[PDB]
Amino acid sequence: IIIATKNGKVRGMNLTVFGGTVTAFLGIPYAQPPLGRLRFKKPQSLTKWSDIWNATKYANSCCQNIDQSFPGFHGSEMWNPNTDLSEDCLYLNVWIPAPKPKNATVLIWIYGGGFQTGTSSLHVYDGKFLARVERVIVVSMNYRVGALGFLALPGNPEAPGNMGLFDQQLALQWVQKNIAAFGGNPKSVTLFGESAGAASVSLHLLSPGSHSLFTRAILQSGSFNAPWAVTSLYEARNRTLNLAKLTGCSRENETEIIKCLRNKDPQEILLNEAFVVPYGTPLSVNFGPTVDGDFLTDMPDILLELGQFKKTQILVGVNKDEGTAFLVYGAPGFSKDNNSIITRKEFQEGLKIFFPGVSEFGKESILFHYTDWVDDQRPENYREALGDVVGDYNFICPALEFTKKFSEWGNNAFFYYFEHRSSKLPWPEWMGVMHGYEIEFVFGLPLERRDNYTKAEEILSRSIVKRWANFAKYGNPNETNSTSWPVFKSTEQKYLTLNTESTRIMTKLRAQQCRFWTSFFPKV
Amino acid sequence: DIIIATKNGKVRGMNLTVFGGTVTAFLGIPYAQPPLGRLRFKKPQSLTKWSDIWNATKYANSCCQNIDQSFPGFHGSEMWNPNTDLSEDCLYLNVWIPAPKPKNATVLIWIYGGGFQTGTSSLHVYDGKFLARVERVIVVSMNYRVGALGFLALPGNPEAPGNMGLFDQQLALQWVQKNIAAFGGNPKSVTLFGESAGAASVSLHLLSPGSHSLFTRAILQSGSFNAPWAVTSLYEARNRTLNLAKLTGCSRENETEIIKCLRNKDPQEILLNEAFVVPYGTPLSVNFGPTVDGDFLTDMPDILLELGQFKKTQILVGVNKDEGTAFLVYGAPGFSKDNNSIITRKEFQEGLKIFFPGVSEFGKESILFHYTDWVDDQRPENYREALGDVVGDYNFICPALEFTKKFSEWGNNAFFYYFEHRSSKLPWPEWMGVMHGYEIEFVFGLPLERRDNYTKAEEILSRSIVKRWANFAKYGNPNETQNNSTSWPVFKSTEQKYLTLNTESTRIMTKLRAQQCRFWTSFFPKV
Ligand SMILES: COCCN(C[C@@H]1CCCN(C2Cc3ccccc3C2)C1)C(=O)c1cc([N+](=O)[O-])c2cccnc2c1O
Ligand SMILES: COCCN(C[C@@H]1CCCN(C2Cc3ccccc3C2)C1)C(=O)c1cc([N+](=O)[O-])c2cccnc2c1O
Ligand SMILES: *[C@@H]1O[C@H](CO)[C@@H](O[C@@H]2O[C@H](CO)[C@@H](O)[C@H](O)[C@H]2NC(C)=O)[C@H](O)[C@H]1NC(C)=O
Ligand SMILES: *[C@@H]1O[C@H](CO)[C@@H](O[C@@H]2O[C@H](CO)[C@@H](O)[C@H](O)[C@H]2NC(C)=O)[C@H](O)[C@H]1NC(C)=O
Ligand SMILES: *[C@@H]1O[C@H](CO)[C@@H](O[C@@H]2O[C@H](CO)[C@@H](O)[C@H](O)[C@H]2NC(C)=O)[C@H](O)[C@H]1NC(C)=O
Ligand SMILES: *[C@H]1O[C@H](CO)[C@@H](O[C@@H]2O[C@H](CO)[C@@H](O)[C@H](O)[C@H]2NC(C)=O)[C@H](O)[C@H]1NC(C)=O
Ligand SMILES: *[C@@H]1O[C@H](CO)[C@@H](O)[C@H](O)[C@H]1NC(C)=O
Ligand SMILES: *[C@@H]1O[C@H](CO)[C@@H](O)[C@H](O)[C@H]1NC(C)=O
Ligand SMILES: *[C@@H]1O[C@H](CO)[C@@H](O)[C@H](O)[C@H]1NC(C)=O
Ligand SMILES: *[C@@H]1O[C@H](CO)[C@@H](O)[C@H](O)[C@H]1NC(C)=O
Ligand SMILES: *[C@@H]1O[C@H](CO)[C@@H](O)[C@H](O)[C@H]1NC(C)=O
Ligand SMILES: *[C@H]1O[C@H](CO)[C@@H](O)[C@H](O)[C@H]1NC(C)=O
Ligand SMILES: *[C@H]1O[C@H](CO)[C@@H](O)[C@H](O)[C@H]1NC(C)=O
Ligand SMILES: *[C@H]1O[C@H](CO)[C@@H](O)[C@H](O)[C@H]1NC(C)=O
Ligand SMILES: [Cl-]
Ligand SMILES: [Cl-]
Ligand SMILES: [Cl-]
Ligand SMILES: [Cl-]
């Protein structure tokens, strides 16, 4: 099994998937390894290789800090990289159905994290099911995370910012120039990603360089207008200097600061990343996208409001309990080992952790808007209240807002609200429908009947899988005897719920809560 | 001839013709020494006796007060202006009695509203003859001193201790205790009722130990003491007295001379300086009102209320739908009685600055936020109705619901009503809605006069309210009839049930405007 790429040949492997076969290529390199003097620089193009590259194993994962908060716990360790870490990590994966097609539509995955972690080789990102069941080609790449991917000295090509974004862009360029040889259609390419990946996707809509490299976009629990998504030009600079000071690299010329940083062991850069910002929360993006004047020629909010982006169809949505995951990593009184009931004042110190710079007036206005109880007793009210605060502000409200303004320019947008909790979800029952736990359903994992998912979950997974694939192909997320999914329009603003019971059409998702974040919190 | 022997001498009345029957009325019985000369600013002095027969056949003087002349010739405003001569000699009261004379009639006592600055018991809408004819109750109403003449305060100084007007009310209540039996009344069945400042005065009599043996039950219409305008702190009363002294050229070193100086000023110069003792000044300002005097009020009313130190008895409480509207046309920009008064977002914002002078710019945006979750964006009346509801909820509805909640918690039956009908004869524009004060004519049974151009529905409604009010007084329960009538349930802190009052359908409901009152009770104190 061998395919001819424009930089040399690559050998794949056959996978057995539901009585059929999927042709998979794991670990095709798409750029020069960013080592030594190439550290912190935009990815450089590759030269041809004479012999055969064996793409039969997942490549290295990009350098990153590892979540070791809960040793032995699957809930956290399932997100930890499952291959060796290395600065040599610019590779991608390609899955193809068997037999092979002539012009299949292509789905490209951009993994999530806080831009600090993640890799394409995770079990939940396995594209072989998607290749078998809907006969699409599935691509996923590794991109640089943390300071190695997003360190910024604006105007200076030695570390300009958004390197990790340019990695993604280079992988998309690779698909354009190579995917036809695999039987793919470069004129029908759909990006999708979760959280930071979804925000990465939304950034590709803004950036001129990415205009011609894909067709449509899917944004799961993320967008660039999320409060955590983009760092100001000034706060990025403050973090680069904090990092240099912490690494014994403080200088006067910055050209020499970068020189010093290039001599540091990767671990010394990684292990200091947490300290570059004082108000460190688990939602902190220490090094993420910034306005570099290259990938982002201007402030994202401005570009969105002026409508200077790629005009195309989008699929957008969020989970029911996006906030809970972040509460167990710092907020007081919360644990995965108890029911995590908290008191009015525990709620208050929580708000102080997630809103460090906000006045006590503002942390009271917030407390106000989220205590108009339906039931006075509970006592779980506050534990769910703080959850909803984080979730609404960090994920749900920015997403509705992004979808509203994107639709305003005459493009079809579709919005979803994912309400089902996995029967195998390793976290406690109070955390609900968590950040990131729609991903296994999008990748068709419950289709594996030997895998301890319920029948109801397989049916649901099949719907999402079908809808996602049809959206990629046709621009409309329809199924087969299935609820018709309507466009999100700024007037009526309809969205679809996804659960095992009854998939309904509804309106004005959490419009009351999002009212506060969009039209009052900015004035505090 | 019509003559009753009171403990201060004999008094002569008159016969009135009311609905084919007769009502005996005694108008202008004096209940205290005229607060004249050196008696100015002092608690009312008891009456001695008169040898002859006092002729109670005309309304007495109204107490000194400024007159509303914003709209000369306009009935809507001038109907509240006094209809007798003004004078410091005003401590008189009125008595209406059914005929034939009763044996042990229940007595309803009316305390008029205002900002504690105006008002009088002789208004057309305060006519007790209908109530006496239709429900066979005895109706009593008194005049009490208003403005600085009634509430000027130098706390601890018997020359002007504060709350004189409240003590005026209280002495009239003593008069009823001592004399009403001679008219055929039951002094052990006495019910206070009043509107606004009258309602606030009523709620204070529940607090004040001195009044506790002087009445049985209470009715509060559009007012209570916990309203932001109702009660002035001990220091703010003193500072206003001094501001007044400075404004009139009466500043001294001892207080005895300031009072001695203020006593020589013409009643009119004190009146013209009342508005200036408070720096900001809105149409809701109570320049001189009740204060904590250490006599009538031994502590801040909220403390006594929270501690349960009040008279334990039944109460009837309620408010109107558009309490705020009346005050917007007397100062808020863009508003007029001659337009539909549709306003813009920023007119709304400058309006807010008029009614909340001491509040941060943050708070004036918080209010705006809580009150702009529009159902229909346009709807151009949105902001005009938003501001009305702000003033109304903050000043009347929420403090009333709050009072009723806290009062009910100590185990007495409270009933709450919500008055929603606009009068077919209301002289104000339609956008002002169900205004402050325009339930009074329905409570006094005015639409029962068929010669007066009210709708039939309105007579039905009035007759209903009159029945409930009188039944509350007699039995402690505002029932209409046992059958073919909506059950009016007690207000409890849990369900918070209230009754709506209108021509269409009187229904039982819960948690009146709970979302709005939430903001005022649990967020506004934190701004
Ligand atoms: C959906 O994926 C599930 C795994 N998570 C979500 C978890 C949330 C709580 C924190 N932990 C772990 C990560 C880690 C790494 C080393 C040591 C300790 C910890 C704590 C991850 C991510 O990859 C992830 C991570 C960040 N961040 O680093 O701040 C985000 C920031 C803004 C928006 N989205 C983010 C996001 O989605
Ligand atoms: C049910 O009464 C119907 C008539 N009004 C209500 C009108 C409202 C608009 C203002 N005018 C004033 C204007 C003005 C100027 C010069 C001389 C006389 C007047 C009359 C009265 C009152 O008697 C009355 C009055 C005040 N106050 O004067 O501050 C209240 C304060 C707090 C709570 N309630 C109050 C209240 O109910
Ligand atoms: C008027 O009615 C009252 C009752 O409200 C009569 O009452 C006194 O009433 C109390 C109970 O309320 C009794 O304990 C007393 O014994 C009563 N006193 C007397 C002398 O009977 C009162 O008598 C009635 N007055 C009349 C009918 O003239
Ligand atoms: C007491 O009354 C005074 C007099 O109005 C209030 O006023 C301020 O400060 C001085 C008083 O010494 C005046 O000259 C100013 O004009 C007043 N300020 C304004 C903005 O008018 C004072 O606030 C009151 N204080 C108390 C404790 O009651
Ligand atoms: C309204 O309801 C009250 C119940 O609270 C009725 O009260 C009774 O009235 C009779 C005389 O009419 C008294 O002898 C009883 O003592 C009262 N019962 C009490 C106080 O519990 C009242 O009659 C009802 N009236 C109408 C018109 O329905
Ligand atoms: C009992 O009294 C009710 C009043 O509460 C009367 O019903 C009303 O009838 C008049 C016309 O006769 C209508 O204008 C009202 O709208 C009716 N009110 C209702 C239905 O609530 C009637 O006298 C009696 N009704 C019954 C059902 O016995
Ligand atoms: C394996 O690869 C061969 C070609 O080498 C191909 O014919 C076959 O379909 C693939 N899958 C299986 C079943 O081995
Ligand atoms: C590539 O795969 C082939 C067949 O499995 C194997 O013989 C060879 O060692 C691998 N590496 C290279 C460089 O060919
Ligand atoms: C930067 O500093 C280095 C050594 O400190 C020096 O050689 C170089 O000329 C400097 N470059 C600029 C542009 O200042
Ligand atoms: C499914 O769950 C069972 C326990 O009932 C476990 O033994 C097995 O390893 C699980 N299989 C997978 C694929 O997770
Ligand atoms: C879904 O919608 C597309 C729109 O082109 C249509 O072609 C198709 O028949 C529908 N159903 C399925 C299962 O694709
Ligand atoms: C459990 O979590 C920690 C103990 O590890 C503690 O702070 C908290 O009080 C506990 N939660 C509950 C609900 O008891
Ligand atoms: C009216 O009062 C009574 C009747 O109840 C009696 O004195 C006479 O009929 C009338 N009195 C008058 C008008 O002098
Ligand atoms: C109407 O009231 C007066 C003029 O009669 C004026 O102050 C105000 O601007 C007018 N407003 C509207 C909306 O007519
Ligand atoms: Cl940030
Ligand atoms: Cl009659
Ligand atoms: Cl209108
Ligand atoms: Cl009843």
Side-chain angles (χ1 to χ4, degrees), chain A residues 1-47 49 51-278 280-480 482-501 503-524, chain B residues 1-234 236-252 254-279 281-503 505-527:
Chain A
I1 320 159
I2 289 179
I3 294 284
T5 76
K6 290 199 169 133
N7 298 102
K9 325 186 65 177
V10 291
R11 182 190 335 268
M13 56 192 293
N14 279 335
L15 305 179
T16 312
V17 191
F18 307 153
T21 280
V22 173
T23 321
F25 303 87
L26 305 186
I28 310 175
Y30 69 92
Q32 291 191 233
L35 285 168
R37 293 303 181 187
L38 283 187
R39 179 185 282 175
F40 305 121
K41 296 198 51 169
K42 305 209 299 175
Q44 228 53 246
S45 315
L46 220 35
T47 50
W49 64 82
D51 60 341
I52 296 181
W53 181 275
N54 286 336
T56 54
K57 58 182 287 186
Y58 285 122
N60 293 321
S61 300
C62 292
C63 288
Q64 60 182 269
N65 296 109
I66 314 301
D67 178 17
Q68 292 166 307
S69 306
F70 314 112
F73 179 48
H74 182 241
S76 60
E77 294 187 346
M78 69 175 282
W79 301 107
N80 292 346
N82 62 349
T83 70
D84 286 336
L85 307 186
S86 166
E87 291 196 84
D88 175 15
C89 58
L90 302 188
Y91 303 80
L92 53 80
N93 311 291
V94 184
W95 287 269
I96 298 154
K100 168 179 144 175
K102 335 316 216 128
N103 232 198
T105 74
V106 181
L107 278 162
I108 305 185
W109 176 249
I110 306 170
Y111 55 76
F115 294 102
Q116 324 296 302
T117 65
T119 188
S120 56
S121 55
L122 288 189
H123 180 42
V124 289
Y125 305 151
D126 204 329
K128 76 197 176 194
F129 304 113
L130 268 174
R132 176 63 168 89
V133 175
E134 300 293 331
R135 292 201 69 249
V136 286
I137 297 184
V138 186
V139 185
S140 65
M141 89 294 283
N142 290 346
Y143 65 83
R144 282 167 288 167
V145 282
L148 294 176
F150 294 95
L151 185 84
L153 290 172
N156 199 325
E158 289 285 300
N162 298 336
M163 294 86 72
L165 284 167
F166 276 115
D167 290 346
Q168 302 171 14
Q169 191 181 79
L170 199 59
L172 304 197
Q173 201 135 7
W174 183 92
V175 166
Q176 287 305 299
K177 281 157 189 59
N178 292 278
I179 209 55
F182 296 81
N185 182 10
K187 303 195 199 76
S188 188
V189 171
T190 291
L191 308 183
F192 68 129
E194 190 267 358
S195 201
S200 296
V201 166
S202 66
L203 282 167
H204 286 291
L205 294 166
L206 298 188
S207 176
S210 295
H211 190 291
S212 67
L213 309 179
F214 72 112
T215 301
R216 288 179 258 279
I218 311 169
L219 290 72
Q220 306 168 203
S221 301
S223 47
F224 61 72
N225 62 321
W228 48 261
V230 180
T231 319
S232 70
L233 198 76
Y234 176 72
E235 182 120 39
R237 189 177 183 85
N238 204 49
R239 292 176 188 189
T240 293
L241 298 177
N242 290 4
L243 171 70
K245 166 181 187 59
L246 288 158
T247 54
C249 283
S250 283
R251 304 290 195 261
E252 284 195 64
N253 257 7
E254 301 171 342
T255 296
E256 283 254 317
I257 289 185
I258 299 310
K259 202 188 169 198
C260 173
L261 281 172
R262 279 203 268 261
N263 294 334
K264 306 291 302 181
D265 296 88
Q267 269 298 74
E268 254 172 353
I269 287 168
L270 295 180
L271 283 171
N272 286 290
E273 285 184 350
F275 309 110
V276 305
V277 50
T281 87
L283 279 140
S284 288
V285 171
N286 300 311
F287 294 87
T290 52
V291 181
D292 66 335
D294 194 349
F295 193 76
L296 268 195
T297 65
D298 208 329
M299 216 85 226
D301 295 288
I302 301 178
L303 297 170
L304 180 61
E305 175 95 1
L306 294 201
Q308 316 180 11
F309 49 80
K310 178 183 181 67
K311 301 305 175 342
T312 198
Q313 301 76 53
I314 61 165
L315 199 170
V316 184
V318 297
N319 301 6
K320 179 173 182 279
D321 299 61
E322 297 272 5
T324 53
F326 304 89
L327 303 177
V328 305
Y329 283 96
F334 286 77
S335 171
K336 71 174 186 65
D337 302 317
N338 49 41
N339 43 47
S340 296
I341 292 199
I342 53 162
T343 63
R344 173 187 172 90
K345 62 178 238 176
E346 286 175 296
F347 178 93
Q348 284 183 300
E349 305 115 11
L351 274 191
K352 190 161 40 142
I353 294 170
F354 288 84
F355 299 87
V358 178
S359 58
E360 291 82 356
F361 182 87
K363 300 178 280 156
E364 179 85 29
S365 95
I366 297 177
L367 190 153
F368 181 61
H369 198 90
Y370 275 78
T371 40
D372 196 1
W373 308 131
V374 172
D375 186 328
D376 307 305
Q377 295 288 75
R378 225 63 247 277
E380 304 101 343
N381 288 313
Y382 282 124
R383 176 203 74 198
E384 303 177 347
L386 190 61
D388 279 322
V389 171
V390 172
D392 288 342
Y393 172 57
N394 286 284
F395 299 101
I396 298 183
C397 293
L400 291 164
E401 220 52 48
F402 172 82
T403 313
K404 294 173 193 176
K405 295 188 170 294
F406 188 91
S407 70
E408 297 283 20
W409 290 86
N411 294 108
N412 282 3
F414 302 89
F415 201 89
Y416 76 79
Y417 183 66
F418 184 84
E419 282 180 301
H420 177 67
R421 174 181 157 104
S422 166
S423 61
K424 307 176 54 71
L425 192 155
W427 301 95
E429 298 167 36
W430 69 259
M431 305 189 57
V433 191
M434 288 182 55
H435 188 63
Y437 285 90
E438 86 285 358
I439 300 171
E440 48 195 60
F441 282 83
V442 174
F443 277 87
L445 264 76
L447 300 199
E448 179 58 54
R449 298 189 177 162
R450 285 170 186 157
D451 209 347
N452 271 333
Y453 286 100
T454 70
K455 185 64 188 184
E457 283 170 344
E458 157 185 6
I459 298 313
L460 172 53
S461 184
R462 273 215 152 81
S463 333
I464 291 170
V465 162
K466 182 71 67 202
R467 292 185 180 273
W468 263 233
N470 277 327
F471 177 82
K473 290 171 183 172
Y474 309 121
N476 181 34
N478 57 359
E479 207 183 351
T480 47
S482 56
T483 304
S484 175
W485 196 349
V487 155
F488 188 104
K489 292 303 219 159
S490 189
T491 305
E492 292 180 336
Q493 293 167 26
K494 279 178 167 184
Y495 71 97
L496 175 72
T497 60
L498 298 173
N499 51 67
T500 52
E501 325 172 50
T503 61
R504 328 175 58 178
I505 297 165
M506 271 173 255
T507 62
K508 296 306 206 307
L509 172 56
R510 298 179 71 80
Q512 163 216 338
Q513 296 84 345
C514 283
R515 188 183 159 251
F516 169 84
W517 301 111
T518 58
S519 276
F520 188 73
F521 195 70
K523 300 182 176 186
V524 76
Chain B
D1 201 349
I2 313 117
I3 289 179
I4 301 285
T6 81
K7 292 239 170 187
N8 299 101
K10 324 186 143 181
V11 63
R12 180 188 270 113
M14 58 190 294
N15 278 336
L16 302 179
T17 312
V18 192
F19 308 149
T22 285
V23 172
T24 322
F26 303 88
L27 303 186
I29 302 176
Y31 70 92
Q33 291 189 24
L36 285 168
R38 69 149 207 145
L39 281 187
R40 179 185 282 173
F41 303 124
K42 297 194 52 81
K43 305 209 298 175
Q45 297 307 315
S46 316
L47 224 35
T48 50
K49 181 161 186 167
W50 60 82
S51 35
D52 61 341
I53 299 180
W54 183 278
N55 286 333
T57 50
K58 61 179 288 186
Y59 286 125
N61 294 321
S62 301
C63 295
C64 289
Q65 58 185 269
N66 295 306
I67 311 299
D68 178 17
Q69 292 164 308
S70 306
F71 314 111
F74 182 48
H75 180 238
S77 60
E78 292 188 346
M79 71 177 284
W80 303 109
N81 290 345
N83 61 349
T84 68
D85 288 334
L86 309 188
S87 167
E88 292 197 85
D89 174 16
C90 55
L91 302 187
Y92 304 83
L93 55 80
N94 313 294
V95 183
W96 287 269
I97 300 153
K101 164 154 176 183
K103 315 191 184 302
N104 219 7
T106 286
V107 181
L108 279 60
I109 308 187
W110 176 252
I111 306 171
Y112 54 76
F116 293 98
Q117 321 292 301
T118 72
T120 180
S121 51
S122 57
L123 288 189
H124 178 42
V125 289
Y126 303 153
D127 206 328
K129 76 197 177 194
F130 301 100
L131 269 174
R133 176 64 165 92
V134 174
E135 300 296 332
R136 285 192 61 73
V137 290
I138 291 184
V139 183
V140 182
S141 64
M142 90 295 283
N143 295 347
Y144 62 92
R145 283 167 287 167
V146 285
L149 296 176
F151 295 96
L152 182 80
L154 291 173
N157 196 326
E159 286 286 302
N163 297 334
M164 295 86 75
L166 283 167
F167 276 114
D168 293 348
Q169 300 168 13
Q170 193 185 80
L171 199 58
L173 305 197
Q174 198 85 75
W175 186 93
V176 169
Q177 283 302 297
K178 281 159 188 194
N179 292 280
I180 213 55
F183 299 80
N186 181 9
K188 302 194 199 75
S189 188
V190 173
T191 294
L192 308 181
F193 68 129
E195 187 264 356
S196 198
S201 298
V202 168
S203 69
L204 282 169
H205 284 291
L206 294 167
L207 295 189
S208 178
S211 297
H212 275 195
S213 65
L214 309 179
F215 66 106
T216 302
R217 289 181 260 279
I219 309 167
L220 288 71
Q221 306 168 200
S222 302
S224 47
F225 61 71
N226 64 323
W229 47 262
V231 182
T232 324
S233 68
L234 191 76
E236 183 59 42
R238 183 178 179 85
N239 205 48
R240 289 177 186 188
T241 294
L242 301 178
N243 289 5
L244 173 70
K246 236 180 187 95
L247 287 157
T248 57
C250 282
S251 282
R252 305 290 192 263
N254 72 82
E255 302 171 341
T256 49
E257 224 71 42
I258 294 185
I259 298 309
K260 209 186 171 198
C261 172
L262 279 172
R263 279 204 189 103
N264 295 334
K265 300 290 173 174
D266 298 271
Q268 266 299 334
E269 249 187 355
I270 288 167
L271 294 183
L272 280 3
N273 288 290
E274 284 186 352
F276 310 138
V277 309
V278 50
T282 84
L284 279 137
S285 287
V286 172
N287 299 287
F288 291 87
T291 198
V292 179
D293 65 334
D295 189 348
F296 195 92
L297 265 194
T298 68
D299 206 329
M300 290 294 313
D302 293 288
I303 305 279
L304 300 171
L305 179 63
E306 172 225 351
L307 295 200
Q309 316 179 10
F310 48 81
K311 175 183 179 67
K312 300 307 178 343
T313 199
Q314 303 76 52
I315 61 166
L316 199 169
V317 184
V319 294
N320 297 0
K321 178 172 181 278
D322 301 303
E323 299 274 2
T325 48
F327 304 88
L328 303 178
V329 304
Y330 281 95
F335 286 76
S336 171
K337 68 175 184 66
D338 303 317
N339 329 318
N340 42 48
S341 296
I342 297 199
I343 54 161
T344 63
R345 173 188 175 90
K346 61 179 50 186
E347 289 176 298
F348 178 94
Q349 282 183 299
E350 304 192 319
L352 274 189
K353 186 156 36 65
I354 296 315
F355 290 93
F356 301 86
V359 176
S360 59
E361 301 86 355
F362 284 100
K364 303 180 170 83
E365 189 85 28
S366 293
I367 302 176
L368 190 154
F369 182 60
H370 201 91
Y371 277 83
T372 42
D373 199 1
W374 308 128
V375 172
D376 186 329
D377 303 79
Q378 297 291 341
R379 262 298 166 183
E381 302 98 342
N382 291 313
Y383 281 115
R384 174 202 74 196
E385 300 174 344
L387 192 61
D389 281 322
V390 171
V391 174
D393 289 345
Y394 172 58
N395 286 282
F396 296 93
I397 298 183
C398 293
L401 291 163
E402 273 313 301
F403 170 82
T404 314
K405 294 174 192 176
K406 298 187 172 296
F407 188 92
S408 71
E409 293 177 334
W410 291 87
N412 292 109
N413 282 4
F415 300 88
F416 203 95
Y417 73 78
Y418 182 66
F419 182 82
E420 280 181 299
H421 178 73
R422 173 182 156 105
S423 167
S424 61
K425 309 181 55 157
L426 189 48
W428 303 94
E430 195 100 16
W431 71 260
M432 304 191 59
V434 192
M435 286 181 56
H436 187 63
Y438 287 94
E439 90 287 0
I440 303 170
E441 48 192 60
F442 283 83
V443 169
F444 278 89
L446 265 75
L448 299 200
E449 178 62 58
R450 296 190 174 98
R451 290 168 340 192
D452 211 348
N453 273 335
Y454 283 100
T455 76
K456 184 63 188 184
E458 283 170 342
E459 157 185 6
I460 298 312
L461 174 55
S462 182
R463 196 169 284 269
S464 193
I465 282 171
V466 161
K467 179 67 65 202
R468 292 185 182 273
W469 264 232
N471 276 327
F472 177 81
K474 291 172 184 173
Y475 307 118
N477 180 33
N479 54 0
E480 208 184 354
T481 45
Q482 182 192 288
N483 297 333
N484 206 21
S485 172
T486 300
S487 174
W488 192 350
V490 299
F491 186 105
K492 290 302 220 160
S493 52
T494 16
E495 290 183 336
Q496 296 169 27
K497 281 175 169 182
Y498 69 96
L499 177 68
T500 61
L501 298 174
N502 46 63
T503 50
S505 64
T506 59
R507 325 180 295 280
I508 299 164
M509 268 171 255
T510 62
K511 295 176 146 179
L512 172 57
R513 299 176 71 80
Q515 165 216 339
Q516 295 85 344
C517 284
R518 188 182 159 251
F519 167 85
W520 300 111
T521 59
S522 274
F523 185 72
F524 194 67
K526 298 184 175 71
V527 78

